[PDB]
Amino acid sequence: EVKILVDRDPVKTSFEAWAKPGHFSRTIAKGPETTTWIWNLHADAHDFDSHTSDLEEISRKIFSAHFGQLSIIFLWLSGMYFH
Amino acid sequence: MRDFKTYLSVAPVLSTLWFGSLAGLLIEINRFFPDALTFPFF
Amino acid sequence: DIAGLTPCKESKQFAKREKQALKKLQASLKLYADDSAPALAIKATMEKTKKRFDNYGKYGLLCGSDGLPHLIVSGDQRHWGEFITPGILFLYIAGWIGWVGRSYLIAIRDEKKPTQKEIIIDVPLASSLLFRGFSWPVAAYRELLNGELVDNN
Amino acid sequence: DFLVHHAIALGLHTTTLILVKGALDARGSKLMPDKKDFGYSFPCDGPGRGGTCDISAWDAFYLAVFWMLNTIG
Amino acid sequence: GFTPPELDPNTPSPIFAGSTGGLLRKAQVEEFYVITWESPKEQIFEMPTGGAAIMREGPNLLKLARKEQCLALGTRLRSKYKIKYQFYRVFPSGEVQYLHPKDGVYPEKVNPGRQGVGLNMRSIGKNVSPIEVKFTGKQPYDL
Amino acid sequence: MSHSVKIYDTCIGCTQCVRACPTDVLEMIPWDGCKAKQIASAPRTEDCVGCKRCESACPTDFLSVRVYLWHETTRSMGLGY
Amino acid sequence: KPPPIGPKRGSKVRIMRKESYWYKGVGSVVAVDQDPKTRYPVVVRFNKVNYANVSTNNYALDEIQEVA
Ligand code: CLA
Ligand SMILES: CC1=C(/C=C/C(C)=C/C=C/C(C)=C\C=C\C=C(C)\C=C\C=C(C)\C=C\C2=C(C)CCCC2(C)C)C(C)(C)CCC1
Ligand code: SF4
Ligand code: SF4
């Protein structure tokens, strides 16, 4: 029962979500009406539990964020070894 | 490409590019014209 | 000799401060061979210090009793380059920045969603308006004369 | 002396700013148009309208006491 | 003419194992509130005093210390389980005051027969300045 | 000896002030000054705690429901003890 | 024969209400209630949101000023 359960190509790699700030939630993607929105955009950025109610997407985002953190740590270690 | 250029036009990326260019200009000016306390050209 | 200040090129304490700086730099220099990179860096620092002191002496700065140059902002024509000329240059640059920002805000004021043009800067219009601040004093003076600078609400 | 006198002027101007803002917005502002009905000293007006902590003129006095202490220091 | 339902003291209580958030001396010297509802199925709910209880099928009676606790529990029952609820206030003298639906209809929806209390026939900015109410007990908003 | 809750004539008729009340202070009564034909009322201000949730949901330019803090009791101080 | 009361819809109006967030602002009329018992019939929409993130309100005839 413990197998490799993996779905192929769930998210399309594109810069469309880069061009729209705050795409992850609904109350924020409508656009800024006040300056507070900007702060909100940096407050709910990594709150994956509030973006979606599905545990699968949250877990996948967690896994890839961990990978990015490991990449940053390896970059920092490379910098220390170079210096 | 249009979406990537829109991302390059967002506030932090554009601010980073502008302030990096400004900081580089100021640093090069301070290298070529160091220790400036007055304006002696006139 | 304004406010009892000797000129920096005729001040004994200024030369004394230069002597202490050069002595400390030579004491740091004595730890390395002259052909090494740290020695070259220290020598460049000493040459920069000598050039700085010579320039401060020749610029006409008035040095106080402590050996440091004192700026005079009262408007004396001998010292217009300490405050007044850099002040005019700063005012020109700041008026440039403010006029460009105000022009950009005015240009994107009558749009469907103007805020979208603030989080995401529309670069072609901004680059078009960047050089409009070169003639900012003339434009600002005329706008004030035509009553366009202020808003009567 | 020049630098410390300009710091003194900064402290005087800032404390005056806080106290004058409190005095002139004591009767009301755009956030709380009916502040005069709530007296001189009241805690807040709730978390509505974004949040209304330290909105009374008494709170302006309380904030300005810190700046007065800093200026006299 | 809606009549208030009388409290039934013999109403069974939800199955609870005991908590420190329940009643205190205020329930003895002063009033305490009692919420009664009708569960159509034996299920489990969350107490407003911390912890979880198991309501039994049929009528259920729960005594709490504050009206806010009673209203929060009733709102949870109405929103999540769809149960009609009524709570009362009980004094140490034994008096019972039927509190929440004052006319049998929920306060959010309009019902004829209600009288206006605290109604001011003016905009909020037309209030009288305090200087005009000085040395009198009347407040600007009470006028 | 209670917080003073006042309803003004600028009330649209939205019941959000009533739904946002945790102590059942406000209710909806019939009226004729708006499209909704109803206005809020505060007959049970003795149970008002002062949380100001009611005026945190009022959508007018300024609040048609106003809670003025006043003399405080055991049920106005939110005391369960 | 009875003409509609209030400003025509879509027209610009000044508010002149001291307690309003848009006291000196200019808004657009979107609807006027023709019921004579309605105290605040003039529905005005503004471009800027207030502190409650609401850009629409109801105002009476005396708290309405036409602009050219
Ligand atoms: C024996 C093999 C194995 C190894 C070495 C690891 C190791 C690791 N896992 Mg775990 N994991 C495994 C089996 C394994 N896992 C299995 C079978 C499952 C599914 C049940 C998981 C589920 C899992 C999750 C959900 C997560 C991790 C995470 C991590 C990392 C956290 C520890 C840390 O960063 O230290 C530092 C450690 C190292 C850098 C030392 C070198 C390890 C190398 C680089 C890793 C290669 C291991 C990989 C499993 C095999 C290659 C696969 C192949 C197709 C290339 C670490 C790289 C967390 C994470 O950081 O993810 C990015 C995380 O989110 N693991
Ligand atoms: C000589 C001198 C001096 C003195 C000075 C003085 C004393 C001055 C004064 C001054 C003044 C007393 C002034 C006034 C003014 C007023 C007003 C009223 C203003 C206004 C302004 C404006 C309006 C602006 C605008 C703009 C522009 C134009 C650009 C940018 C942007 C903006 C929009 C901001 C000293 C000794 C220090 C030093 C030396 C020199
Ligand atoms: S008091 Fe507030 S919530 Fe109640 S009807 Fe009036 S505006 Fe709506
Ligand atoms: S302050 Fe709280 S308890 Fe009082 S009326 Fe408003 S919502 Fe109800």
Q: Whose CA is nearest to atom 31 of ligand 2?
A: C98
Measured from the Cβ of residue B40, the count of other Cβ atoms closer than 10 Å reads 14
**Is beta strand C69-70 parallel, antiparallel or unpaired with respect to C62-63?**
antiparallel
- Experimental technique, in short, is cryo-EM
Contact G52/D34, CB-based, under 8 Å?
Answer: no
Going by C-alpha positions, the residue among F38, D33, F35, F55 that lies closest to residue G42 is F35
| Interface mutation vs chain G, best among D27, D29, D30, most G CBs within 10 Å | D30
F10 closest CA partner among G39, E140, D31, G49: G39
Neighbours of C147 (CB within 10 A): 9
Please give the backbone phi and psi of residue F25, each rounded to the nearest 5 degrees, phi first.
-85, -45
Q: Are E2 and E112 in contact (CB under 8 A)?
A: no
Is residue E130 less than 8 Å (CB to CB) from chain D? yes
Whichever domain contains B30, its CATH number is: 1.20.5.510
Return the amino acid letter for F80.
Answer: G
Chain centroid offset of residue F19 CA? 10
- Measured in angstroms, the resolution is 3.2
Q: Is D27 annotated as a binding residue?
A: no
Beta carbons of E114 and F44 less than 8 angstroms apart: no
Portion 20-59 of A in contact with B at CB < 8 A: 21
Q: Which chains does E contact via 3+ CB–CB distances below 8 A?
A: D, F, G
Distance F11 CA to ligand 3 centre (A): 5
Alpha-carbon gap, residue C45 to C50, rounded angstroms: 9
For residue G28, the one-letter residue type is S
Given a contact cutoff of 8 angstroms between Cβ atoms, the answer to whether B38 and C61 are in contact is yes
Q: Do F10 and G52 touch (CB under 8 A)?
A: no
Closest CA to E108 of C39, C27, F17, B40: F17
- Nearest chain E alpha carbon to D40: E130
**Between the CA of residue F61 and those of C55, G21, G51, G56, what are the distances in Å?**
65, 6, 9, 8
Q: Shortest Cα distance from F52 to chain D (angstroms)?
A: 6
Which range of residues forms the domain containing residue B20? 12-36
Residue E119 is which amino acid? Answer: L
Q: Tell which residue, E142, G51, F9, has the closest CA to residue D32.
A: G51
Q: Are B3 and A18 in contact (CB under 8 A)?
A: yes
The whole-angstrom separation of Cα F76 and Cα C56 is 73
Helices (H), A21-54: 26-29, 36-41, 48-51
Which residue is associated with the tokens 């100001």? Answer: F52
The helix (H) or strand (E) run that includes residue F3 is none
Query: In sequence order, what E strands does C50-119 have?
Result: 62-63, 69-70
Mind giving me the DSSP string for G2-63?
PPPPSPPTT-EEE---TTSTTTT-EEEEEEE---TT-S--EEEE-SS--TTS--EEEE-STT
Which atom of ligand 1 lies closest to the CA of A74?
39
For residues G14 and C153, what is the distance between their CA atoms, to the nearest angstrom? 11
> In angstroms, what CA-CA distances link E22 with A35, E32, E66, F77?
45, 11, 10, 18
With CA atoms as reference, report the closest residue to G68 among G7, G17, G5, G22.
G7
Report the nearest-CA residue for atom 2 of ligand 4: F51
Residues of B in contact with C119 (CB under 8 A): 10-11
